[PDB]
């Protein structure tokens with residue numbers, strides 16, 4: 001399993017900040033999006049072969065509503081998915097959401113973007129399982 005953290009290869013961008021002021025994250029922190037629709041967290045995964053991977057997103061949502069995300073591969077050219085991100089009850093309570101996705105052989109820029117004006121939940125990490133995968137190119 002490829003485990004992608006902020007501040008490590010394969011983490012590309014957050015529209016917002018990398019923060020560490022709520023306990024329970026892993027790595028050096030978590031991605032905190034701007035509170036705006038479309039605000040994103042972006043990763044890059046290189047896959048030696050095309051095929052289905054399971055993506056596991058670890059997150060905290062201390063808000064009062066779902067902050068669902070759109071998850072696209074290569075700017076939507078290689079896939080458009082929906083990720084449900086319900087409240088976790090506190091900014092210190094982390095849960096996971098899992099989605100199966102079809103990665104293309106080579107570079108896969110994965111952008112998770114807020115569907116609501118609240119932005120995303122705080123995102124701790126992205127875990128990727130399936131075939132041979134490593135950090136890709138931002139790009």
Ligand SMILES: O=C(O)[C@H]1O[C@H](O)[C@H](O)[C@@H](O)[C@@H]1O
Pocket residue numbers: 019022032033035063091118119120121122
């Ligand atoms: O509603 C939000 O998105 C934000 O709420 C608070 O500021 C919280 O401390 C942040 O970590 C969170 O990102």
Ligand SMILES: [Ca+2]
Pocket residue numbers: 016032033034035118119120121
């Ligand atoms: Ca935020």
Ligand SMILES: [Ca+2]
Pocket residue numbers: 005006025026027028029030123124125
């Ligand atoms: Ca983290």
